[PDB]
Design a protein around this nucleic acid. Structure first.
Lengths: 184, 185, 135, 135, 183, 135, 135, 183
DNA sequence: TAAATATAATATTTAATATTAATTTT
DNA sequence: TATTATAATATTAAATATTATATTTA
DNA sequence: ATATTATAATATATAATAATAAATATTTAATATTATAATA
C-alpha cells in the first residue's frame, strides 16, 4: 500500500528511523547494511518501504532499493519465516551473496548469521530453490536433425531417433552414428 | 479512506505503480486499460485509488474516472468476486463493452478474457442483471412436449418459458406444441 | 486517530464526499444538513472528521462542527444502533431540537425521521436520558 | 506508525488535542504533564507519538520526549496494563520518580494515584523489577 | 462429528425437536414435511443427521433420509444459502421434485415458497444445475463381462443385470432378462 | 445443543451440579430456585438444559421447565444481558411475577433483585413489554 | 462442560489416557501424581476432569479429586499460567504442599520445578496469596 | 477430547463410515487401507479416532492402529499439510514404507500417490528427517517395450505383462502366457 | 470509619518450537 | 377510512471479568 | 524419353475431450423499516 518515501531523517537510532515527512515522522526499522549507507540526521534519504500489517501492530520496513523490499516480501511470504529473521538475513549477507548461496545450496556461509540453525538453512534453501530461478533441443541435436532430414528421415522420425538415446560428450558426426547404431 | 491523489507517477512497474504525493509514494495496482493512458514517470496523474482492508495487508487500486471506480466497488461487493477478477475484467475490456454485452447476455465476450471461465460469466450476467444495469455507468402432455424439445436440440429454458407463456389446457398435445413453435418465433 | 481535516473541495457526489487535502483525497460521509452548509467545489473548507473501524473497511465522517461529532460518538457507542441510522437521525434534525426532544421524551418526532420506527425512538430516549448535559 | 509528529495545534480540549499537520488534524491524547509543556493553539509543537492499533479503533498518544514514549511502550507491554493505566501513571508522576521508586520498591507513591489500587502497584513494581539494568 | 441418530423421541414442539438418546436429549429441528413422518412422543426413531458449526453456536439438523442430508449440505455449501432458506425450500417441496425442477431451472414452482425472492431462485438454480449424478456372483460377473464385450458400459450393464433376475440364476436366462431393456 | 438431560445427581456444589449420565458427569449450573426443586445427591432427575457457546468456554445451564429455558434464551438474546445477570433475575423472584412486573412496568420490584440497577431494570421492562406479546 | 467422568481405562501412555465410557474413549491428560494414583488398565475409574475450549482443539484434564480440578481452573484463569505449566506444577508438588508454599512464601520449591523461572514462581505467590484466603 | 470409539458400523460409504456408538452415529472419514481392513456393515469395531476442529467445522479421522493416529497428528502439525493430503498419502500406501523412505530420502515413491507434487513430498522429507528421532525386473520392462514396438496399446500391454509377470520364468514365456489374456 | 453496591472504567490472547548461552563431562 | 400478513431491503452485529472508587448507611 | 496428369491413396490442421496445478476468496443471522397488496 506504500512503496517509497521522500522525507527527512529526523532521528536515527539502532535499528529504527524517524522520517519527518511534512512534519510527520514515521517509525521505520532498517537493517544494519542499510544503516551503514545512510547519511546523517536531517538528510533526505531514499527508502523503498513495505508495511507489515498485523491486527495489533504494524511494521514499517524500508530499503534503499526496490530489489531488497521485493526479496523481503518473498521471504515474509514464506511459511515459517518472520520479518526480523529475514532482517537478520540481509543484515548478514547481501542480495548477490544470498542468491548465489541459494543457487549453490550453501549453508556454511549463512549459518554465521545469528538465529540461523540447520533447519533454518533447510527451509530457506527448499523455498528459494524453486521460488526464483533466474535472478537479475541442442545445437548438435539440431544439426543431427537437419542431417537426417537431408538423409531422407522425416523430422518427427529424426527427432524420435535423436531422442531415443542420450548421446553425451560426443561430436555431431559420431552421435548420429551411435544413435543410428543404437536401436538397430 | 482514499479516493484521489493529486500526485506524480514516481514509478511504473506493471501492473503496480508508485504515485508520489508530497514525497509519499504508495503501492498502487491498476488495470492494463488504465496503463495505456498513464503518462510518463514523474508526471502528475489523475487516478482514483481504492483501499481494500484486510487483517493481513492493504493495497491501492487506481481508476481513471468515476464510472469504473463505481463499477469496481460494486463488482467487489459481490460474494464471489475478488480484486484480481475485476482487474482482469477491466484490463480485457471497457465498461461500455461489458454493459452492452450483459444487456445482450453473451458469455462468449466474457470468457475470452484470461482467468474468466463459463461459471464466472453467468455469475456476472445474473448478478448484474439482478438490478444494477438499467443506467449506463406439469401435465403429461407438457412433459412430453418438453422431452421432445430436449430430444430436438432445445435447451430446457426455452422449452420451459414457451410452455409457461402458452400453456395447454384439456386438449391434445399436437396443437399447443404447434402454436408454441409458432410462439417462440 | 483523526479529529479534524482542512482541505479543498475536490468534488461533490452526495451522500459521499471527497476532500482533497495536500493533494490527498478522503472519502467521508456527510449529513444532508451539512450538505446545506458546504461551499462550492474547490473551496478550502475545514471538516471535523471521525473514523469508524470494522474488520474489512472503514468510513470517515466529515463534520462542520464539534458537538455534532461527539453526539455521533455517544450514539454509535450504543450496541443496538449503528452509524447509518445516526446519519438518518442527523439528516432529520439538528442538535438543539433533538436535545429538547429527548429531554421532552417524545418518540413521535423521531418517527417522522426516515428509517426510524417507534421502538428505536424510545431506544434513543432511554439510552440518552442521562448521558449528556444541556450545553 | 508515526514515530514523531510536528504540526500546529489546531485546538485544545482536555485531555485530547488536534495537531493540524499541513491540513490534517489528528485526534491525539497526551498526559497532563505534557499539557503543562503544551503551548497555546496555533503553535508548531513536536510530539514523539505512537499509534495503538485495535480491531475497531486506532489511538495516537503524543509525547514531548522520546523516553516517556519508551516508558509508555514498556508499560503497555505489561500483560494487564493498557493505554489508560499507563496514561494515569504518566499524568500522576514523573519518569525519574518512577525509576527511583522502583529501585526503592515503593508502593505508597503509586497507590496514591487515582484509579490505582494495591494490586496494580505491586504488579507494576514486581514485573518492572527485572528491567532497568541498562538505563 | 454427527452423521446419524438412532434414539427415542422425548417431546414435540415444532419445528424444534428433542431426542433423548440414552439419557441426554438432542436439540434438533426437522422440516414440516418430516413432521408428517415423525412418530409419537416416547417412540424411537432413526434420523439421518448433520451438524452445523457457527462462530457462536452449534446447530443440529436431522432428516429422515441420508440423501436429504447430502442435498442439505450441498445447499449450505452455496455462498448465498443459509439453513433457514434450505428449510423453507424443503418445507415447500420434496427432494426429487426439487431435483427435477433444478433440471428444469424453473422459478415459478419455487417462488411460491414463502419468503423466497425470485433473484434467490435463479441464482440457486444456476449454481445448483446438474453437475452431480441424477437421482458379484459368477452369473453377475459373466453377464457384466459379456455386455462389456457387447459394448455396454460396466455401470450401465450392472444395473440392468442385477435388477430384474434373482440371485444365482442360469446365466443365459439372466443375460436375456438383462438385455430385455430398451431406451 | 442439549435441550433436556435425564441424569443422576453426582455432585452438589451450588450453584453448580454434576449429572452423571451413563458415567459421563457434566458441569450443570442451576439457579437457587431450581436448587429448591432439586432432589438430593444420587437422585435421578431430568433437567431441561441450554447451551452457551463462546470462543474459549462452553457451559451448561439446566432448568426444571421448558419455559425457563426459552425465557433464558430470549433474555440472553438481548444485547446488554449476560448469563449471570439473567441467572440473578430468575434467582431473585419467580417467572410469572417477572411477566406480571413487565406487563405492569414494575421497575421497583425488579430493582430489589440483587445485582440489578434501575437502568438495567427499565431496559428489561422496555425490551420485554412487547416481546412476550401475551404469548 | 465435563466435570466428572466414570469409565474404564483402555490405555495408559503418559501423559495421555483414554477412558472407554460405553464405547466412547475420551483422550485426557492427568498429572503424574494422578498417574501413580491410577489403578490398572481395564477397570472402571472415576475422574474429576475439565475441558479446555478454543478455536482449534479441545483437550481434557482429569484429576482424581475435585479440588485439584478447581485449583487447575483457578490457575488457568490467570493470564501468565498455562495448562502445561500448571500440570507441571501439580506434578512436581502436592496440592496442600503448594498451598503451604504459597502461604509461607516458599519460592525455591517452585524454583526447583523444571522449566519454572523464579519470576513465574513469585507471580504464582503474589496472585495466589490474594486469590485464595486459605480455603 | 476424543481418542477412541467402540460402536457398531451402521453405514459405510467411502471414504466415510457411520459407527453407531451407543445409539449415536458418527460420520468418520477413513483411508482406503482402513476401509479394506474394516469389517462389514453392522459389525462392532474399535477405532483410533483423531479429533479435528475448525472454527466453523469439526471432523474425525479414525484408524485401526494408534501409530497411524500419531503420525497423522504430526503430519497435521505441519502448517503446509492439510487433512486431504495426509488422507491421500496414507490411503495410497502403507506406513512402514513411508518411514523407510523417510529414512531412505525417497521422493518418487511419494510422488506417485495422487495429489502429491515433487515439492510436497520433498518438503515432507525435509521436516520428517528431523521429526523422526527414534520411532518387477528388467524383463518386466523389456516385455512392455517389445509389446509397444510390436503394435500393442501401451496400457493394456502393461496390464497383460503385470497380470502374470515373469518373476520366476523367462521373458519370452511370460509374454507367451500374457498373450493368453486378450486371446 | 468500614464496607455494599452498583457504576463505570479498563482491560482482555495462547502453544509451540527453534536458537543460544552457560554448564557438564572426557 | 384504518389494518395486517408478506416481502424486499438495509443495517448491525458479539464480548465480559476485574478492580477503583463514588455515595451511603450505618 | 519426358512429362503429365486423370484418377488412386494419404497425415495432419483443426474441431473436440480430460486431468492439473497455480491462484485465489474466504459471513451470514436476526431484526426493524418501509412498501405493498389485500382487506372490515
Amino acid at each position: 500500500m506504500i512503496g517509497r518515501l521522500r522525507g527527512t531523517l529526523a532521528e536515527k537510532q539502532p535499528p529504527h528511523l524517524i522520517l519527518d515527512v511534512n512534519g510527520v515522522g514515521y517509525e521505520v526499522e532498517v537493517p544494519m547494511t542499510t544503516l551503514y549507507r545512510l547519511p546523517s540526521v536531517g538528510e533526505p534519504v531514499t527508502l523503498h518501504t513495505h508495511l507489515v500489517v498485523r491486527e495489533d501492530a504494524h511494521l514499517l520496513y524500508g530499503f534503499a532499493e526496490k530489489r531488497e523490499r521485493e526479496l523481503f516480501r518473498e521471504l515474509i511470504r514464506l511459511n515459517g519465516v518472520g520479518p526480523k529473521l529475514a532482517l537478520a538475513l540481509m543484515s548478514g549477507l547481501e542480495v548477490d551473496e544470498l542468491v548465489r548461496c541459494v543457487q549453490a545450496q550453501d549453508t556454511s556461509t549463512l549459518v554465521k548469521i545469528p538465529g540461523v540453525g540447520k533447519k533454518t538453512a533447510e527451509r530457506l534453501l527448499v523455498e528459494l530453490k524453486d521460488r526464483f530461478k533466474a535472478w537479475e533441443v541442442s545445437s548438435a541435436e539440431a544439426d543431427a536433425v537437419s542431417a537426417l532430414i537431408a538423409l531422407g528421415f522425416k523430422p518427427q522420425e529424426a527427432s524420435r531417433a535423436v531422442a531415443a538415446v542420450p548421446g553425451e560428450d560426443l561430436s555431431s558426426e559420431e552421435m548420429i552414428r551411435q544413435a543410428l547404431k543404437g536401436m538397430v
